Symmetry: D2
Amino acid sequence: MQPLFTQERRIFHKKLLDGNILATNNRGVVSNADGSNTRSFNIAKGIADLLHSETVSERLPGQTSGNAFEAICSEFVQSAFEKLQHIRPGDWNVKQVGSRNRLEIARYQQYAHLTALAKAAEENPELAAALGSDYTITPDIIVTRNLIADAEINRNEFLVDENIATYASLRAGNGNMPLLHASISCKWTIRSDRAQNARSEGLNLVRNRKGRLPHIVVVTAEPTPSRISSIALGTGEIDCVYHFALYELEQILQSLNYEDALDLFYIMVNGKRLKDISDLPLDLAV
Amino acid sequence: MQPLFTQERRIFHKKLLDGNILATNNRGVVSNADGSNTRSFNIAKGIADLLHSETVSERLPGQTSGNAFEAICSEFVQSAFEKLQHIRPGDWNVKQVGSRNRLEIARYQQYAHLTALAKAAEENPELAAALGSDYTITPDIIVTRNLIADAEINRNEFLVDENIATYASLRAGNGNMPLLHASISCKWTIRSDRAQNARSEGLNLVRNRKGRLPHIVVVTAEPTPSRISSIALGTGEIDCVYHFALYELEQILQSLNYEDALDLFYIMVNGKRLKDISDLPLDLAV
Amino acid sequence: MQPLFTQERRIFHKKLLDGNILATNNRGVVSNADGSNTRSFNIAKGIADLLHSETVSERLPGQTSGNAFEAICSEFVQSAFEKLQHIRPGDWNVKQVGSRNRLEIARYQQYAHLTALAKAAEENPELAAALGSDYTITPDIIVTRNLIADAEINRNEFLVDENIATYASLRAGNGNMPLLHASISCKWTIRSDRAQNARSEGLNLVRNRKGRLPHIVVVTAEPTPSRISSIALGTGEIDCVYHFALYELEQILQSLNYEDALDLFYIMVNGKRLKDISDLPLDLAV
Amino acid sequence: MQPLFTQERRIFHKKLLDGNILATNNRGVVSNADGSNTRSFNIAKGIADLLHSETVSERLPGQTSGNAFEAICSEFVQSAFEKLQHIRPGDWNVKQVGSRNRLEIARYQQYAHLTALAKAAEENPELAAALGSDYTITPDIIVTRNLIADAEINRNEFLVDENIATYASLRAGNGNMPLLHASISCKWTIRSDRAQNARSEGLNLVRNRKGRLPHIVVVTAEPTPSRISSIALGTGEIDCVYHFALYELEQILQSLNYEDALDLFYIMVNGKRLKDISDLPLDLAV
DNA sequence: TGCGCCGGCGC
DNA sequence: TGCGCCGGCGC
DNA sequence: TGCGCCGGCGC
DNA sequence: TGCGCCGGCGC
Ligand SMILES: [Ca+2]
Ligand SMILES: [Ca+2]
Ligand SMILES: [Ca+2]
Ligand SMILES: [Ca+2]
Ligand SMILES: [Ca+2]
């Protein structure tokens, strides 16, 4: 049959189709297009043909398509990542946090101290104002790793006891919390202004961490390379951007002769800023 | 037996005593102390006593203790990290880079674009000037990961063929290099001004990466908490600092009844900015 | 009569009213409210009463209200700033750039080199991909300062000739461009996601500058302190946020007893992150 | 007469020759040279010759040349900047801070919150640890601006009463302190590692400011371009570097026929990363 | 070579 | 309540 | 006091 | 064409 990552990739698409997240309205507008832009329209039509989309229905409201894209991205990650246990073992959990959560990063080892700052600020309003703060990281999807018992550390050799390596992050106990492995931002579609919150979130993770920075990634179904470029280009905040259908996007850009769009596409891909959704699970194993 | 990490820790200490790196001169000054300062003198002597330091010899040139401390840290990480294959598998290398070689990080995937950038500056002086920046990132010790065969991704299951997950960093071939896993900076002793180059370096890794940030840590044998804090305190550049002899420092701070410095020790240690050398191998397995 | 800044402040409001930028629809929704949020509705109603708004008309499309708010903010700045010539002299120009421009910062001394990087990237696609780039700063409104002749430098004393101070930024000649004094972002209303492009723009200005960083400021008519807070709180990117009607906002928060909103309001104002529109001209003279 | 800035420049040089800061020891080593290196030896001797350095004495202790170079830079800036009141008016102070005093920038408006932050850490150790960071920003030389009376804002026109522009930074009273205009770091000579503390400091000013960023510059007497470049190259932390004797350096680089170093000089100078001491007073008037 | 190592100690 | 989701489209 | 200055020179 | 504007509102 298919290789399993290939099957999960199609499962991923099938859920977008089945849910009418991806569909075409009766004016021929594919639902991830900017219907008032010809290039967006054409690129999204082609991807949707390549994905064998057939349903005709009205575009879903954006809150609905945004939410569903996250859940569906979340299910793909969890399912594929859990097959990489021999390359990246651990007690992994993949969670869609939500578009309504907050303070959630403080749940995790590298950012726990942010609980203490918040509580300090609410108690002392002078401290609140004097503070820079910035404890507002609300990821769409997290991947976390729970902590390991000595039994696991000492699986094959007597490596540790209670008198050595007493601060190691992976060691369960002393009120240690789970590690944040990845923050995954989802963008069903992009406009260059609303795309920038992924950068500020990446930036917040970078500047406030105690310990190893998580993976910071963005997944998008945006059809146009230019809008993808407002989040993908540049370094420092975002590790890499992953497209819901890269291969399909490549094909359509080639057959349409949007030559600047194709050039921008290769700049990002060859520039290590844009990958396929199927590359994400393995990139989470590095 | 002792746990193996406790044995490794004692081997790291005995390399510093045996190699005359950590020793006491004819005036009673321990060789990581700042002899002009009573507290640094007393804290360092206290650490040497708890390490059972016995040798009398004159302080080595700075350049020699610097290099030697670095080799011995490098050997500790390599021997101890190799025990952790079941929690962080792979084909790992640990290397002690040096000022001799140039453009070292650019041999690794997340920073390879820096070669192209330098070649571009080199041929066009107008471009060299426009970009401004030249010199590039040179950590003391790096840990790198070699890439993985398809047979090993597919060890258990038919996960990938050559038509899926084709940009994934860990996958061998496709114009791929090894991955930088960790940048480890060493400071045998510290002065607050010359500590800061570990921060500019950390920042360079951060801002320039394509892919997940490496581990960015500092290992130091500095005796006084105030000097350690010049590098330890704060977040954003350094993941964590590792003391060469944390338990002994804590113990001497208590015995010398230096409460202000004991406070600062705990600010750092309780604040997750400072740990023992022995936490580092497990911290690199996150 | 009124002090002149007070008159410009009312002129500013009158243009928002006259243009129906600020008005109330026939359901009682004030046009800067989020009509589906009760607190937004109530706060905007009160400000609009305090500004003596009377017109009833349908909300303008967002592209129209956004554009007009910029022009109107632009006219206020220019007009008031030009009265500060004795505190901040110079050949000043205030320009609404537009929501369609690009590369415009490269027009200015501190960012000119960005022209060279763009031209280098389009010529060499390998260089394009290898590049980090990030020359995408599109301010809404700029303030610039043209360069000064020796006659002005030497107005009262013979300070300079052609053999001293030959690189001074303010000196006209040798193909020197005008200085960027300020970038002013306008946000008629806010949602926390679309607010973050002001941060990335501020960040781009910070990281790419050669010479003194411009003022980086945000002007907003957003009624709710919480949405204002998604751009105002935190430091490093934005110098300060200026509200189109702060005094009115203070009054209404007090009379409504939204006590957490009032607390957040004082956190920002007392925390030097939020000011009135009338404070901007003087803050541009520092 | 010479132009006044040319006279000031010669007075700055003669303070270094007369004060024995810049001199040649009995071995022919000029006192800002690294005697072990032929190029630094030759470039420094060449600069001393063009400055008409005549004194023979032994090199002063590092601590003394460091401090003395700093006082003399400070005096140059103060005397020359005072001539620029017609292009940058105000009530300016120039001061040479020192390691003796602590929490110096916090006396200025944009960084006053740092006092509150430190007081908060000091009373609550859990908070001190949560925040992590303690120590704070200590530039070598600062230029500050005192605040302005209402009579002077209203000198020409009735601009403001007490009901408008009530949070404006420049306006005296209302719980206002002076403004930090410039942070000036000095490095009599450089080594690449100890250069980097001017970068961490620059970054601290950047990231922590409430209001416009101060001028952030470095003045250095370092002879070799490679060492100057360790601080000069790049953007984001330092606005610009200023050489103590740029014309003389350029001239010696040409006469010594050191083409590689001449290149690097131009990369820096043409790239707007390096200028002469004499450009600094006008650069602070931007 | 020259970069970046650490040390001594003045302010 | 409220935060952040995407969509329509003018300038 | 102790922080942050610069210097010598090994690798 | 295309970039960035704001608005409606679900989850
Ligand atoms: Ca999202
Ligand atoms: Ca080092
Ligand atoms: Ca805007
Ligand atoms: Ca200095
Ligand atoms: Ca010495």
